[PDB]
Amino acid sequence: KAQPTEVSSILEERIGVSDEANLNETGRVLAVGDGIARVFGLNNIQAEELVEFSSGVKGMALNLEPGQVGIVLFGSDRLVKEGELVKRTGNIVDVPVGPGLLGRVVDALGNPIDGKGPIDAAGRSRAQVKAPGILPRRSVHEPVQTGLKAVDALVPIGRGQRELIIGDRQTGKTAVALDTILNQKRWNNGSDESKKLYCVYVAVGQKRSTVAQLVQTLEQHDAMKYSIIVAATASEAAPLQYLAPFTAASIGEWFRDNGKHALIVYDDLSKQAVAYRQLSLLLRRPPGREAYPGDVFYLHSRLLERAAKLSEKEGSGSLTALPVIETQGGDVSAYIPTNVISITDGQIFLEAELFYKGIRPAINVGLSVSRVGSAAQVKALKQVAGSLKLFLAQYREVAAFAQFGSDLDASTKQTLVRGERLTQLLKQNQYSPLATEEQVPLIYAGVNGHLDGIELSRIGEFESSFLSYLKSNHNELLTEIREKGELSKELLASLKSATESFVAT
Amino acid sequence: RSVLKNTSVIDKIESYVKQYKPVKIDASKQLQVIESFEKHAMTNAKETESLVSKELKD
Amino acid sequence: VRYEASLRQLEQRQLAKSVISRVQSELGNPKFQEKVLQQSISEIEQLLSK
Numbered sequence: 319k320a321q322p323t324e325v326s327s328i329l330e331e332r333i334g335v336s337d338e339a340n341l342n343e344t345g346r347v348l349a350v351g352d353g354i355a356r357v358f359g360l361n362n363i364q365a366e367e368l369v370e371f372s373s374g375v376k377g378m379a380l381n382l383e384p385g386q387v388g389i390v391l392f393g394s395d396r397l398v399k400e401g402e403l404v405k406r407t408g409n410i411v412d413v414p415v416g417p418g419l420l421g422r423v424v425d426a427l428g429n430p431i432d433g434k435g436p437i438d439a440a441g442r443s444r445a446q447v448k449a450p451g452i453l454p455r456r457s458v459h460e461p462v463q464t465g466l467k468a469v470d471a472l473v474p475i476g477r478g479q480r481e482l483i484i485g486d487r488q489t490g491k492t493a494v495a496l497d498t499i500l501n502q503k504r505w506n507n508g509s510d511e512s513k514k515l516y517c518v519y520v521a522v523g524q525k526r527s528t529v530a531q532l533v534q535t536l537e538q539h540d541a542m543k544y545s546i547i548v549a550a551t552a553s554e555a556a557p558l559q560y561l562a563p564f565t566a567a568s569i570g571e572w573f574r575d576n577g578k579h580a581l582i583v584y585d586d587l588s589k590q591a592v593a594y595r596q597l598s599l600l601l602r603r604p605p606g607r608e609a610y611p612g613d614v615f616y617l618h619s620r621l622l623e624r625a626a627k628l629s630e631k632e633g634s635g636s637l638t639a640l641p642v643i644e645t646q647g648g649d650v651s652a653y654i655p656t657n658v659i660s661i662t663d664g665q666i667f668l669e670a671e672l673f674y675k676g677i678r679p680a681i682n683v684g685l686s687v688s689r690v691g692s693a694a695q696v697k698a699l700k701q702v703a704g705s706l707k708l709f710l711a712q713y714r715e716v717a718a719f720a721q722f723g724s725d726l727d728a729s730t731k732q733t734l735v736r737g738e739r740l741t742q743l744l745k746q747n748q749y750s751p752l753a754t755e756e757q758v759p760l761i762y763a764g765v766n767g768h769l770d771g772i773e774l775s776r777i778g779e780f781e782s783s784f785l786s787y788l789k790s791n792h793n794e795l796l797t798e799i800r801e802k803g804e805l806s807k808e809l810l811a812s813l814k815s816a817t818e819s820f821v822a823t
Numbered sequence: 824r825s826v827l828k829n830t831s832v833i834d835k836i837e838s839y840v841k842q843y844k845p846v847k848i849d850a851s852k853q854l855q856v857i858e859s860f861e862k863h864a865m866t867n868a869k870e871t872e873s874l875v876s877k878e879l880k881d
Numbered sequence: 882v883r884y885e886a887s888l889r890q891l892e893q894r895q896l897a898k899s900v901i902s903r904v905q906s907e908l909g910n911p912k913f914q915e916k917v918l919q920q921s922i923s924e925i926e927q928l929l930s931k
């Protein structure tokens with residue numbers, strides 16, 4: 319209505335700034351080609367200072383020289399014209415942080431693209447913040463319940479444990495962190511903030527239609543009330559795609575330094591490396607391996623180091639990071655991923671053939687591992703999955719061994735049958751997260767060989783059948799697993815009886 | 824309701840729901856055929872029970 | 882509520898083409914002439930602040 323004209327006219331009153339508009343920055347643009355611009359003047363400019371051109375496009379002054387300063391653009395060069403007037407902000411590049419960012423969808427600069435008006439920001443924060451030192455940290459001791467079966471079973475995640483999701487094109491990578499965010503609805507509907515866990519998804523270099531459908535889907539399952547989307551789509555400039563994950567990392571630091579717990583998801587760092595080498599080659603800087611500048615390790619390094627678990631002295635904040643790396647044909651020896659593997663605290667490899675067999679999630683257990691996840695696994699899951707990874711590696715040993723058609727003893731054929739049941743067990747449809755109380759009895763049935771008499775095709779209906787069985791009947795045991803997160807011997811035997819009851823069908 | 828500033832129907836559909844707030848009563852209709860089913864049940868059950876309690880000691 | 886937000890956005894884009902109408906109203910004026918004195922007194926106010 320006219321209330322937008324009211325708000326815009328109050329902003330016209332601010333437009334008061336003209337009465338104190340004596341900028342000590344303005345200088346002419348010498349040249350501006352190939353995503354860069356040399357500007358004369360600006361003799362009190364700062365290093366990595368945000369400036370704004372006369373055509374409204376902002377920029378970061380990245381390299382300072384006696385004579386000129388090279389400023390990168392934050393958009394197309396079609397708007398910037400030679401010889402114009404370049405006002406400096408007066409600031410190193412900062413972004414809005416605050417709670418009102420939840421639900422909104424912004425650019426790399428916090429300017430919202432959802433069309434939902436301005437941003438209720440609680441402050442501005444620099445992009446290239448130092449990562450915290452070794453002393454205000456703590457080893458992770460709190461779980462991140464992703465809701466997926468084999469993820470929460472085999473590779474548990476601590477609050478702040480930097481875990482890589484690596485895979486290939488169209489291999490179910492995005493759906494993993496997506497359903498993790500959807501699992502976080504359990505406690506974001508709750509009330510304890512230390513149980514709560516806030517979600518920031520960083521879509522860079524991707525299709526705007528894809529991001530729109532993702533935001534749509536997060537509104538359908540109502541994850542949006544705790545979600546923050548950072549869009550750096552492929553139409554936009556390479557420095558925006560370079561810059562945006564640092565900004566979202568600053569947002570995660572805003573949540574972490576408030577004592578709260580937060581989750582950031584990078585998707586993908588691969589295109590960020592493409593944008594960064596696009597920058598560096600347009601900086602005329604020499605490349606190294608696979609035409610990348612040698613600091614690209616330092617790039618994703620200095621990005622991902624700003625994510626850990628704060629100690630109690632800092633208020634016990636945490637920030638967990640989920641990077642995504644698209645590789646080329648299952649290669650794990652390209653220069654870009656081998657850098658990331660040297661940074662993150664573990665790997666979640668998605669084999670293309672397993673999803674080609676429709677096994678979704680397509681987890682290669684033999685490659686995927688976490689380093690310190692076992693310290694923060696759910697204690698019941700830590701009780702019930704000790705033999706599980708051993709048995710699955712055992713079944714993997716006889717997986718390639720059984721292809722020759724040779725008959726075997728009852729031990730290895732037993733492991734073959736039970737590992738087939740466990741393999742067909744851990745499939746899980748999209749948008750179907752599972753609580754820990756739900757994940758425990760499937761593991762307890764899978765360990766104790768009860769699935770062996772069941773048909774291999776019958777396992778999928780058996781899962782939902784036994785779950786609805788327990789939710790109908792042994793709902794008290796579900797509450798016990800919820801409250802304790804730890805199975806006593808009495809809970810163990812009651813669980814055994816409750817299983818073997820429905821195992822009789 | 825106050826989210827929609829152009830309300831115009833929310834009173835209508837709200838009083839429509841409060842109108843049909845007595846939705847429909849349930850169906851506790853079986854008290855005559857169901858007791859006949861459990862009558863045949865108790866019949867054949869006590870037949871079986873008396874026969875096996877005799878024939879065990881027999 | 883969906884149509885309410887849709888109507889707000891249609892109002893906003895019709896006021897955007899009304900902003901075009903306002904600009905075309907502002908273009909043909911001797912505000913072009915008078916507003917030079919605006920800048921004059923203004924720059925007086927800014928430079929007399931220091």
Ligand SMILES: Nc1ncnc2c1ncn2[C@@H]1O[C@H](COP(=O)(O)OP(=O)(O)OP(=O)(O)O)[C@@H](O)[C@H]1O
Pocket residue numbers: 485486487488489490491492493494644678679746747748749
């Ligand atoms: N558990 C699942 N249930 C149903 N569909 C799934 C599941 N896992 C993966 N998929 C399918 O895999 C396809 C790819 O999803 P996703 O985008 O996560 O893969 P990706 O490797 O991340 O692709 P991109 O990297 O291009 O986003 C989707 O079409 C989705 O339907």
